[PDB]
Amino acid sequence: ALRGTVTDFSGFDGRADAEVLRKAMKGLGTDEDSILNLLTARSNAQRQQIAEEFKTLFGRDLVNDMKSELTGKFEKLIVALMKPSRLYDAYELKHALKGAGTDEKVLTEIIASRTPEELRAIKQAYEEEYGSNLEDDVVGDTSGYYQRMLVVLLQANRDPDTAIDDAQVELDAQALFQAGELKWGTDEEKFITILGTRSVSHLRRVFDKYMTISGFQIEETIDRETSGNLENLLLAVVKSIRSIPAYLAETLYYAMKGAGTDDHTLIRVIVSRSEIDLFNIRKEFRKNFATSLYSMIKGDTSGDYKKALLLLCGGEDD
């Protein structure tokens, strides 16, 4: 069931494509159309093979020459597609923790929606690249319970999915109820432990049983009981337990639906998921917001940026 929209091209020849790319840039001008059409049709691994072929043939750096030729959002999309898939989430979190403040959107979005196995991969790749430890930088930039919830999720140690225990399900449904609605104030430590640590299939049962007991969806209680960064993070975590595709379809829709487009979020979710579950994100987006993701992008973007983004997305209906 989980499926991306970008696959390995059959009859890939790294050497032929690097010559197509050399021609598409040599001279005054840039043929942005040959670049866009070739790269969105190659898998991320293929793009890496191309990049080293281009380097052995011409002794030139593929991504640096593209940076020289291109500009704007389209440059930013093409550079993102060229990041090895192993490094892109690490990349995006370093640049979120970068500068003075911190981009909590980015932190919350990746850390909530990535599985334990993707999170340990991202921590390794981050350390190797940036020479820093991820947990240490996250702690460095955040506070309060938002910080603690991010550190719990960064442990990547959520319980395995196993046979459900109903007595366990109702004990946790009830702890959450006494921890929030029935308390003056909130016991956020109790919400972080059960939401940060219980298995995904056990928590899908907990969220239904909590509805039976209180007449509220856990999302409704999180909005009632918390605010700010912790509220965003706790909602991202619940949404992701329910469906990662659905959560990312929803992230995509708000990056566009307002007046402008949050272009950074739109490039990050299309590129990071192109080879994982972007087909599923298309389905969820159509089913939920009545629009195809293609019409939504086609309406919200322009130029080569738009054309590239659309060959990457790929579906009408979805």
Ligand X SMILES: N[C@@H](COP(=O)(O)OC[C@H](O)CO)C(=O)O
In the complex, which residues of this chain contact ligand X (CB under 6 A)? Answer: 184-186, 225-226
Instruction: Give the max Cα distance, the chain.
Output: 71
Among Ca ion, ligand X, none, the one that 302 touches (CB under a kind-dependent 5 to 8 A) is none
Q: Is 185 in the site for Ca ion (CB under 5 A)?
A: yes
Contact 190/224 with Cβ under 8 angstroms?
no
SS3 7: coil
Residues 233-252 touching Ca ion, rule: CB under 5 A, are none
Least Å distance, CB 38 to Ca ion, is: 15
CB of 206 to ligand X, least distance (A): 20
Which range binds Ca ion by CB under 5 A, 116-124, 139-147, 290-298, 304-312? 139-147
Stretch binding Ca ion (CB under 5 A), from 77-85, 118-126, 164-172, 178-186 = 178-186
Least spacing, CB of residue 158 vs Ca ion, in Å: 23
Question: In the bound complex, what is the minimum distance in angstroms from residue 177's beta carbon to ligand X?
Answer: 12
Q: Which residues contact 282 (CB under 8 A, 6 or more apart)?
A: 5, 249, 292, 293, 294, 313, 314, 315, 318
Q: Which of 55, 57, 60, 47 is nearest to 7 (CA)?
A: 47
CA angle 250, 255, 75 (to 5 degrees): 125
Which string of x and - marks every residue 210-229 that binds Ca ion (by CB under 5 A)?
-------------x---x--
**In contact, 304 and 33? CB cutoff 8 Å:** yes
| Residue 300 interacting entry, from ligand X, Ca ion, none, C-beta within 5 to 8 Å by type | Ca ion
Question: Encoding tokens for residue 189?
Answer: 């430590």
Q: Out of 109, 300, 304, 318, point to the residue binding Ca ion (CB under 5 A).
A: 300
Judged by beta carbon distances under 5 to 8 A according to partner kind, the member of Ca ion, ligand X, none in contact with residue 71 is: Ca ion
Q: Which stretch binds Ca ion (CB under 5 A): 159-167, 170-178, 183-191, 198-206?
A: 183-191
Rg (CA), the chain: 22
CA distance 44 to 34: 17
What's the CA gap between 294 and 314, in Å, rounded?
Answer: 7
Q: Are 36 and 307 in contact (CB under 8 A)?
A: yes
For residues 101 and 185, which CB has a smaller minimum distance to ligand X in the complex? 185
Structure tokens at 48: 């890496």
Which spans of this chain sit near Ca ion (rule: CB under 5 A)? 25, 30, 67, 71, 75, 101-102, 141, 143, 183, 185-186, 223, 227, 231, 256, 261, 300
